[PDB]
Amino acid sequence: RKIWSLIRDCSGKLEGVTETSVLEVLLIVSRVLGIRKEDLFLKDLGVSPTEEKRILELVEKRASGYPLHYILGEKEFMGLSFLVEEGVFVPRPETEELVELALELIRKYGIKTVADIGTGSGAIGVSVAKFSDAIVFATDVSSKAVEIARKNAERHGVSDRFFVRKGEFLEPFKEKFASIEMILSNPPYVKSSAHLFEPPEALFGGEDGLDFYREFFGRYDTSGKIVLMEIGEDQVEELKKIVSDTVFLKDSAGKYRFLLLNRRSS
Numbered sequence: 001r002k003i004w005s006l007i008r009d010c011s012g013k014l015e016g017v018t019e020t021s022v023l024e025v026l027l028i029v030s031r032v033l034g035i036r037k038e039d040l041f042l043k044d045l046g047v048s049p050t051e052e053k054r055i056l057e058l059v060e061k062r063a064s065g066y067p068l069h070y071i072l073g074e075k076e077f078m079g080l081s082f083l084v085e086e087g088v089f090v091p092r093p094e095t096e097e098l099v100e101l102a103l104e105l106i107r108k109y110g111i112k113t114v115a116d117i118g119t120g121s122g123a124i125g126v127s128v129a130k131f132s133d134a135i136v137f138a139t140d141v142s143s144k145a146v147e148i149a150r151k152n153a154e155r156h157g158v159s160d161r162f163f164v165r166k167g168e169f170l171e172p173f174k175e176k177f178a179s180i181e182m183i184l185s186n187p188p189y190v191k192s193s194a195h196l197f198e199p200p201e202a203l204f205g206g207e208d209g210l211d212f213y214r215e216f217f218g219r220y221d222t223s224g225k226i227v228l229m230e231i232g233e234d235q236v237e238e239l240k241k242i243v244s245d246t247v248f249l250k251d252s253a254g255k256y257r258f259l260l261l262n263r264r265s266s
């Protein structure tokens with residue numbers, strides 16, 4: 001019954017999973033009660049028997065390791081509320097930095113047409129679309145991805161400017177390749193031997209982590225375009241062997257996190 005007593009008991013159950021256990025419980029409780037984080041303030045109570053059990057289930061669920069954000073059915077990325085669920089990779093905060101680089105690149109060059117390969121939750125393409133006049137073409141090998149991205153776009157009023165199709169790389173948009181000014185991706189960059197609550201396709205790029213990159217730069221002619229993709233810490237020197245002329249950016253941590261091929265001409 002006692003709501004805040006409950007919240008303490010659960011915090012402890014998540015100490016080996018998260019440093020911020022209390023916040024996770026507050027979130028879970030809020031969700032289960034179908035309420036806003038910020039209304040959790042009455043200084044007393046507010047939870048019924050069946051609600052109590054549900055919360056305990058979900059704390060159990062999370063206790064094992066199951067990502068928090070599958071349970072919430074939601075994730076903030078760029079201060080926008082993105083839907084997620086099993087089968088969709090959950091946005092990481094580092095990818096924000098990528099979207100912010102992409103947006104300045106747009107302003108600088110007045111870019112109007114942008115692609116997002118492996119859109120996932122739609123988190124990069126929708127953001128770029130939401131915070132600029134660009135239109136975005138997005139792909140993903142996964143059907144869940146594409147349903148979810150279409151919903152997220154629609155959920156942020158950019159359905160008129162964010163188009164998503166199932167397929168690999170830009171095969172479903174051969175018709176638009178010409179016009180694409182900027183290709184964006186947070187692809188799978190993890191080794192096969194760096195070993196999931198999230199889709200395997202989303203994480204790994206073979207025993208190297210580079211399987212995506214090799215295919216991309218082999219298959220596609222990037223002349224006249226700009227490429228900008230997130231990358232694993234370690235792969236800078238090997239990536240320089242896949243593509244030359246490429247630039248590589250440090251992130252907030254001061255670790256290389258993005259490759260940047262600018263082939264946009266004057």
Ligand SMILES: C[S@@+](CC[C@H](N)C(=O)[O-])C[C@H]1O[C@@H](n2cnc3c(N)ncnc32)[C@H](O)[C@@H]1O
Nearest residue numbers: 089091118119120123140141168169186187202
């Ligand atoms: C690392 S997750 C990133 C999701 C999203 N870009 C983000 O950062 O939030 C990679 C995503 O790419 C998709 N994917 C992997 N390889 C792909 C490929 N060759 N073509 C299109 N999509 C791909 C997966 O479906 C997955 O959702």
